[PDB]
Every structure is written in C-alpha cells, then in structure tokens.
Amino acid sequence: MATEPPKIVWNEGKRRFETEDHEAFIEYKMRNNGKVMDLVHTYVPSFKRGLGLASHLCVAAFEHASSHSISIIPSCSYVSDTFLPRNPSWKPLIHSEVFKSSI
C-alpha cells in the first residue's frame, strides 16, 4: 500500500527524513510547542533532481504530521508551490500551497 521504492529514513535526532541515498533529506521542527511542523529544506542529488523524490521528502513530513493530527509550515515551499496544487491533500495541515489560499 505505502511501499515506496525509496527508503526514506527518519532521523529523530536531526528531525529529518533521509532518502535511500541519504544525500537527499528533508528537515523540520515542531513549532508552537509542537503543534506546527516547520518543514525546512528539501534537497536531492543530481540522480533524482526532478524525479519527485525531493517533494516526497516534504510529503513524508506531511504523512507524519497529518497522521498525528499536527499542523505544518513548509519552508520547502518550492514543493508547496508546485507540488501542493498537484496534490492538495495537505491543505488541512498547512496554509494550502506555497503561501496563498490563506491569510
């Protein structure tokens, strides 16, 4: 069901998700005492630049917060701007997209 070809590892020490390559990772921090997850820095090597993986890292933080009923703010908004209009499933977590569709 949720078997991703990539193996995105969670580093709770760095509060980050690292792909099967570990060179691509997504960071975040839980703001407001842990009510809002600030998704910080989506990165991916040359091998998987425009393969979606970078955005999947951002989505991994979505999957984490959504299931735990947490809110999110993506500084990864490169993902948010293009990807979130592509899959508007994470609006209930964040603003909506990069920044718009919000106050």
* CATH number for the domain that contains residue 74: 3.40.630.30
Give yes or no for a contact between 37 and 52, defined as CB atoms under 8 angstroms apart.
no
Expressed as residue numbers, the domain containing 12 is 1-103
User: Residue positions in the annotated binding site?
Assistant: 41-44, 50-55, 77-78, 82, 86
- Both tokens of 5, joined, read 């070809």
Cα separation, 34 vs 78, whole angstroms = 23
* Of 42, 44, 53, the residue nearest 78 (C-alpha): 42
Domain count, the chain: 1
* Of 94, 92, 97, the residue nearest 72 (C-alpha): 94
Structural method:
NMR
Q: Is the dihedral of CA 29, 37, 18, 47 positive or negative?
A: negative
Q: Is the dihedral of CA 39, 44, 49, 54 positive or negative?
A: negative
User: Residue positions in the annotated binding site for CoA?
Assistant: 41-44, 50-55, 77-78, 82, 86
Catalytic residue list: 76
In what order do the strands lie in the sheet containing 25-31?
9-11, 16-18, 25-31, 36-43, 71-74
Q: Which residues of 24-35 are buried (b: 16+ CB within 10 A; e: fewer)?
A: bbbbbebeeeee
